[PDB]
Amino acid sequence: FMQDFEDIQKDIEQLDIKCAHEQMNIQKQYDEKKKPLFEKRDEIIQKIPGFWANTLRKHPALSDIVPEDIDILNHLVKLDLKDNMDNNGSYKITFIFGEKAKEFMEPLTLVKHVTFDNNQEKVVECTRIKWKEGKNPIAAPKWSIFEWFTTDELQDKPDVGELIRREIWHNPLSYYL
Amino acid sequence: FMQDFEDIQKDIEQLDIKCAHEQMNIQKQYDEKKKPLFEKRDEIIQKIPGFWANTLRKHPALSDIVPEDIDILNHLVKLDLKDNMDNNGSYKITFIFGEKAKEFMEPLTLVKHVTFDNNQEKVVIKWKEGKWSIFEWFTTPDVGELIRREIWHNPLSYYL
């Protein structure tokens, strides 16, 4: 009877396996249909002066970042989420900065690629920002958003990755307003 | 531009809506295949004295509950989740209690709906004389989700 319950739950899980599979096939139908929309949206962001700067810091968890952060972020021309690469919650976020950001740093493309193992997070890739002399804002209650570009864990320090993926990326216009 | 942006989100949103619709439609086809299998599972539980009473509190979140909940939970004969009610993710949970629970309450079936609209949540017992509380969640620990997210799909996990 302990055994009967296991038998029944085999049968249930087999149906969920097959349900999730079909749903995923549809899921990845539309993921692909979205790709164009996300790209046509990036083109609009390009035409909206300092959009990400004014978007990001309207999120409560990011609102109290150093003012210096804004100086660089004001040249964030492009932000992209590459979501759902693993079936495990994996993603890659990419910051592309206009030329003027060369006053403060190198390179102009920052990437951070992340996976998960046992609900512990692991950073697979991360750009080493090379701040110009006297231009590092991590050198200034507050923290610097660019502190998010480490390999180390972030204890009691906002997961800019997760907030982006789960709250901001789907509709950043909400936050711009 | 502010209109071009507002337009592309609707383009995205309704691609989202669709997707959710077709995915649901699939959920239902399997919710129906599974219905007989819940009947046997429920049929089986009835032959494991105090199954639910013993399954819930082995969940770390509920492990802090007051002894008197157990008294009632011991007379909980049937528990059912009815999930994904709408494109938002609304569910209905129903506790049916045996008749020895008359000692403690009316009515003996307790239904609870948590309803989500296109963004947020709107949510919706008379004790006899002497009778946190797990039933303290029957106001207006998110035990309703502890059940649906984690327990329901395979409760025997927690029994063992």
Residue numbers in the entry:
A (entry chain A): 29 to 168, 181 to 217
B (entry chain B): 29 to 152, 157 to 163, 183 to 191, 198 to 217
The authors write:
A construct of PfNapS consisting residues 29-221 (molecular weight ~23 kDa) crystallized in orthorhombic space group P212121 with solvent content of 55% (the asymmetric unit contains three dimers of PfNapS). Crystal structure of PfNapS was determined using selenium-SAD (single anomalous dispersion) technique at 3.2 Å and refined using native data to 2.8 Å resolution. Four C-terminal residues (aa 218-221) were disordered as were regions 142-150 and 168-181. Each monomer of PfNapS contains domain I comprised of dimerization helix α2 (aa 33-73). The monomer also contains domain II, which is comprised of α-helices [α3 (aa 81-85), α4 (aa 99-102)] and a β sub-domain containing 4 anti-parallel β-strands (aa 106-158). In PfNapS, 23 residues of the dimerization helix α2 and four residues of α7 and α8 (which lie in domain II) contribute to dimer formation via hydrogen bonding and hydrophobic interactions (Asp32, Phe33, Ile36, Gln37, Ile40, Leu43, Asp44, Lys45, Cys47, Glu50, Gln51, Ile54, Gln55, Gln57, Tyr58, Lys61, Lys62, Leu65, Phe66, Lys68, Arg69, Ile72, Ile73 and His210, Pro212, Leu313, Leu217 respectively). Similar to PfNapL and other NAPs in the malaria parasite, PfNapS is also evolutionary distant from homologs in yeast and human. The length of the dimerization helix α2 varies in all the five proteins and PfNapS has the shortest such helix comprising of 41 residues. Also, the r.m.s.d. of PfNapS is lowest with hSET at 1.6 Å indicating high structural identity. Structural analysis reveals two free surface exposed cysteine residues (Cys47 and Cys154) in PfNapS dimer.
